[PDB]
Each structure stands twice: as structure tokens, then as C-alpha cells.
Design a protein around this nucleic acid. Structure first.
Ligand SMILES: [Zn+2]
Ligand SMILES: [Zn+2]
Ligand SMILES: [Zn+2]
Ligand SMILES: [Zn+2]
Lengths: 99, 93
DNA sequence: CACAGGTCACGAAGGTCA
DNA sequence: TGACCTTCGTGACCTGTG
């Protein structure tokens, strides 16, 4: 029950790995942009709940090493059916709830 | 007695195929909702009790491939007429 | 018993805004 | 960034019928 990346209090599985709420958003936001990060120090930052915001290159690496699948991030094209086909069941759940 | 879709313990046939309770519910919802899934991998995932939740595309395709039949799911009109023969056979006993 | 559907607590996507 | 929130799909278990 602990975040595999930073050792923070994990909230459950996210993109197939047990991460905290912050490494969840960081992974999704990072991958969604395809951001390439480069490390300012060596390239083996010992990531923690505190300094986790300082080395992205390494945080995103510990991310992937831990098992997070960028495939599990919904494709913009998919965030679409969901966003819209929301009001599609809401339009039909309204129609049956009329007659 | 094994789910022909994910390997999990099965509870009997469901829509014509030996399946677990998760895949029966998955199959019925996916079919009723006319859902269109698309695999984020190579389209040949290996469904297993512990990852079936990750590829709906392949799970549903596996459902159909082992033989689950959408024609066994009751249509809403059949459901409605049912919970009427349940409300009739109720207010009659 | 076998098997349709029904229930609802619970997991994990995205969104939001300080 | 990330804490907290809204949504909807899941499946263990249950009811009702044939
Ligand atoms: Zn973390
Ligand atoms: Zn680093
Ligand atoms: Zn199954
Ligand atoms: Zn797949």
C-alpha cells in the first residue's frame, strides 16, 4: 500500500502500478505530452515523497521501471466517446424516463 | 469448471459458455451497451484472472470466440415483460 | 440445480483548482 | 503539482424462474 515511485501513501493502482495521487498525475501528464526529461545530477536520484518534484527525468524513469503502462492512459480520441457518450446514455435514460 | 475467458473459477455456463461471474457481467454489459473496444497493445493479449480488467477489447473478443451468445441476453422489452410476470406472480400470492 | 437478471460497495480512469 | 472529487465499469453475491 505504498507508492512504488516516491514511497508516498499510495491510493491504489494507477496505470497498472501502485502509486500515490501525485505520481499518478505526473505519469499521465508526462506521457500525454511525450515530455523527454533530462537529469540535472547523476541519473539515479533516490526519489522520495519530498524531493520527488526535483528530478522529473528520474521520476518518470522510476515510474516506468515500477510498471506503469502509458497504454492505460486514455487516448484523446477515447476521452471523447466518454465525454460525449456520457450525455448519450443521459439522453436515452431521459427518453425512457419520459414514456 | 474454469472460465474459458480468463481462467478464473467458473460458476457454470453463461450465455452458452463456461465462465466466471466477472466475464458474464462483462459480456452482458458490453453487448447491451453495443460497446466498441480497441486494444492498446497488439490485439492478442492473454486474458488472465488478474489482468482481464485491462483489455476489454481482447476480453470481449475472447468471449465471442469461446462462443458466448448475445442472443441469450434478454432485451430490455423482455426484461420489462419479465419483471411484470414477477410483479404479477407477486400480487397473486 | 442451472442460469437469466439485480444489487451496490469498490477500483481506477479523468477533472479541477489552490 | 496533487488532494480531493465525479463517474462509470466490475464482480461477489443474491433473487427468481424453469
Ligand atoms: Zn508517488
Ligand atoms: Zn535525476
Ligand atoms: Zn472469466
Ligand atoms: Zn488486447
Amino acid at each position: 500500500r505504498i507508492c512504488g515511485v516516491c514511497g508516498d501513501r499510495a491510493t491504489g493502482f494507477h496505470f497498472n502500478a501502485m502509486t500515490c495521487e501525485g505520481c499518478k498525475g505526473f505519469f499521465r501528464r508526462s506521457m500525454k505530452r511525450k515530455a523527454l526529461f533530462t537529469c540535472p545530477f547523476n541519473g539515479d536520484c533516490r526519489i522520495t515523497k519530498d524531493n520527488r518534484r526535483h528530478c522529473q527525468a528520474c521520476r518518470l524513469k522510476r515510474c516506468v521501471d515500477i510498471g506503469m503502462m502509458k497504454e492505460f492512459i486514455l487516448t484523446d480520441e477515447e476521452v471523447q466517446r466518454k465525454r460525449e457518450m456520457i450525455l448519450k446514455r443521459k439522453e436515452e435514460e431521459a427518453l425512457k424516463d419520459s414514456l
